[PDB]
Structure 1
Amino acid sequence: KLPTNLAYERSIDPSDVCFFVVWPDDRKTPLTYNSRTLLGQMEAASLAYDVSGQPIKSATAEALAQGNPHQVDFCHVPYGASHIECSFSVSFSSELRQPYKCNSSKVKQTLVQLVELYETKIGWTELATRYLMNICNGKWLWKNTRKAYCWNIVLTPWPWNGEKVGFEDIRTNYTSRQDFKNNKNWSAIVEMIKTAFSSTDGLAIFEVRATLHLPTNAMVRPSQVFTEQNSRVFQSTTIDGERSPILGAFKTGAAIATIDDWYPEATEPLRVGRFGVHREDVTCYRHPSTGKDFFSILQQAEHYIEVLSATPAQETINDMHFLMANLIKGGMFQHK
């Protein structure tokens, strides 16, 4: 139980996204951006009201009508383009089977036996379906597919004997979970994610592109930097000697690892983690005063081993989905 040196490494490795404009010639140019300074009103609540109460005497009626300047990095689709194309790649590996560092060899065989029992009594179908439904519907295009006409996704898997896989008109056709399962090769690309997790040194690699038909001069929203002045600075790259915005490397990984809806109130999915952090609501679920954090489940592994060796789906199956989806991304579990 927490043997003072324990670590895993990730089993799903995504990459940067890249943006290209296509013209009606069908030639492809890298999307660019540029800074601009702009003029806003004094719309705070702190230059006018004090802390806790009565408004200031220094904020008069012609100090609130002054206007302050700011800089933003601005990016849009050029006039005369046809659509945007976005490309990246994912790589499902088999690194969850054994811990990467384990000081005491007593919990190591416990974790190996737990992963094998979970593999053999429950499928790999639920986790692989929940991961693959986020790649081929544009969850990784965070708030770009909102306010758009349509967007279409094309897959190139490895290893593969055949054709590229095509999802088209995703807002209209692919609304539910059944709408994937009646694609003609849904159940042929889940199986390779399954045998990627199942084998000792298995591997699967997907290469993904997607086209976005945004309207005229529409706005494109890439990821941003952690700056400790300029507000809204973008994360950039260099494609064909240019400067282009990316939309993330870790942000893409956070986009396909939001499958957690096994928590107590259980309304809408969230990012798999230790203590169940929600980002809109700035509280957390899964708190260590509810017995549902990852460490209170990791300290019950022998109870799970003996219950998987004879299972009803009330919370035990959900707690071990949570444990396995937290070993697919996992890191240090040391406590110094």
Structure 2
Amino acid sequence: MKLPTNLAYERSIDPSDVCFFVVWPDDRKTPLTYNSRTLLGQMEAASLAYDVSGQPIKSATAEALAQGNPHQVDFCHVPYGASHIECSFSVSFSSELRQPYKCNSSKVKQTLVQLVELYETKIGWTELATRYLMNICNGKWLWKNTRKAYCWNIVLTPWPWNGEKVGFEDIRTNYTSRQDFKNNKNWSAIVEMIKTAFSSTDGLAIFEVRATLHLPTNAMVRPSQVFTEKTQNSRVFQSTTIDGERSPILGAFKTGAAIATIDDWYPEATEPLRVGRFGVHREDVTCYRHPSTGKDFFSILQQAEHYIEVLSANKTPAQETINDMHFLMANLIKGGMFQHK
């Protein structure tokens, strides 16, 4: 199947920013603040003592290395008498993957409408909606604040819902594997909103999420930080205006890239990845699912004729040809433009 010169989708999952508030012993909440401040560190770089050759530069003598290196960082921390910290955002699962957003080829459009119809008939939205909702229901979207903390709690408020706000207390101790989440009081109900918000032609499914972090005394909190385009700022935080005070926030896209760390289908997978075309692992800077592997998105998307006669035939398909369908559907939920030429 030759690609069009216009193909684009809209995303199905719409997160938002995460706001940090300080809860005192009494019922009073305040926007968390920060401050830029200058430190004086050592002069360790290995480009300040070694040139490209490798034997040491002689301009950097033993007196010079101990001189002192003043720099400036933004600095955020929990205040002294505080009790914990609130963190809140909102998600929306919205069925935008049913048909393309723009597609100048009718035969490619009828291909990608039949896949999404044959997928939920034969495979189902149970695996994707379970994997997407695990990263909301435990603090994946709190990135490093989950680490080095006493206990963190999540409280859900699903919108087309009757009552009794869904909560997850002491997530590290009680919510570890999938079977811990299925032992929740209402896990079947919140998965079934996301299965219907991908099935109906108007599925909506708004969640209101809210955290509670218990850190040590006077501890450090780490928000997302901006793309910067006699002391130069070495750490600049992202921020939003709450009331009249500058407060740190978690990137709207930093939050939606925590929900979609799902891709553990890649050819020799251990640790799951953020879903994308030829999926990158930014820790160790490589692409798994490289085009030379043939298991990226476009090499799967051009097998879209072959995947239909697999799913329509009554022999139930192998695990190799469903983990290519999970990866294909979870890229249509991610969005993006899919053109060539």
TM-score of the aligned structures, taking structure 1 as reference length: 0.99
- Structure-to-structure mapping, 1:1-336, within 5 angstroms: 1-228=2-229, 229-310=232-313, 311-336=316-341
Residue 314 (structure 1) shift: 2.6
- Superposed CA deviations along residues 106-152 of structure 1, whole A, max 9, x for unmatched, are 11011101110001111110000000011000000000010000011
Distance (Å, rounded) in 2 between the aligned partners of 1:313 and 1:130? 20
- Superposed CA deviations along residues 51-109 of structure 1, whole A, max 9, x for unmatched, are 13210111111111111110000010000000001000000001000000000111101
User: Which SS does the other structure have where 2:335 is aligned?
Assistant: coil
Is the CA contact (8 Å cut-off) linking 2:95 and 2:197 kept in structure 1? yes
Distance (Å, rounded) in 1 between the aligned partners of 2:161 and 2:115? 31
Distance (Å, rounded) in 2 between the aligned partners of 1:74 and 1:220? 9
Distance (Å, rounded) in 2 between the aligned partners of 1:145 and 1:52? 43
Residue 203 (structure 1) shift: 0.7
Distance (Å, rounded) in 2 between the aligned partners of 1:8 and 1:175? 34
Distance (Å, rounded) in 1 between the aligned partners of 2:203 and 2:176? 32
Distance (Å, rounded) in 2 between the aligned partners of 1:149 and 1:20? 18
Distance (Å, rounded) in 2 between the aligned partners of 1:312 and 1:118? 12
TM-score of the aligned structures, taking structure 2 as reference length: 0.97
Is the CA contact (8 Å cut-off) linking 2:260 and 2:274 kept in structure 1? yes
User: Which SS does the other structure have where 2:57 is aligned?
Assistant: coil
Give me the identity figure in percent. 100
- Superposed CA deviations along residues 286-312 of structure 1, whole A, max 9, x for unmatched, are 000010110000000010000001123
Is the CA contact (8 Å cut-off) linking 2:133 and 2:191 kept in structure 1? yes
Distance (Å, rounded) in 1 between the aligned partners of 2:203 and 2:227? 36
- Superposed CA deviations along residues 247-275 of structure 1, whole A, max 9, x for unmatched, are 11100000100000001111010000101
- Superposed CA deviations along residues 12-54 of structure 1, whole A, max 9, x for unmatched, are 0000000000111110000000000010111010111111321
- Superposed CA deviations along residues 221-257 of structure 1, whole A, max 9, x for unmatched, are 0000111321100001110111000011100000100
Is the CA contact (8 Å cut-off) linking 2:12 and 2:97 kept in structure 1? yes
User: Which SS does the other structure have where 1:190 is aligned?
Assistant: helix
* Superposition misfits of 4+ residues, deviation over 4 angstroms: none
User: Which SS does the other structure have where 1:197 is aligned?
Assistant: coil
The count of residues paired between Structure 1 and Structure 2 equals 336
Structure 2: gaps of 5 or more residues: none
Residue 330 (structure 1) shift: 1.8
Distance (Å, rounded) in 1 between the aligned partners of 2:201 and 2:298? 26
Distance (Å, rounded) in 2 between the aligned partners of 1:151 and 1:63? 46
Distance (Å, rounded) in 2 between the aligned partners of 1:205 and 1:314? 32
Distance (Å, rounded) in 2 between the aligned partners of 1:128 and 1:285? 24
Distance (Å, rounded) in 1 between the aligned partners of 2:32 and 2:54? 48
Distance (Å, rounded) in 2 between the aligned partners of 1:136 and 1:216? 26
Is the CA contact (8 Å cut-off) linking 2:311 and 2:317 kept in structure 1? no
Distance (Å, rounded) in 2 between the aligned partners of 1:237 and 1:182? 37
Distance (Å, rounded) in 2 between the aligned partners of 1:59 and 1:66? 11
User: Which SS does the other structure have where 2:30 is aligned?
Assistant: strand
User: Which SS does the other structure have where 1:238 is aligned?
Assistant: strand
What's the RMSD between the two structures over aligned residues? 0.8
Residue 194 (structure 1) shift: 0.5
Distance (Å, rounded) in 1 between the aligned partners of 2:95 and 2:286? 33
Distance (Å, rounded) in 2 between the aligned partners of 1:162 and 1:55? 69
User: Which SS does the other structure have where 1:64 is aligned?
Assistant: helix
Is the CA contact (8 Å cut-off) linking 2:310 and 2:317 kept in structure 1? no
Residue 331 (structure 1) shift: 1.0
- Superposed CA deviations along residues 200-229 of structure 1, whole A, max 9, x for unmatched, are 111100000010010100000000011132
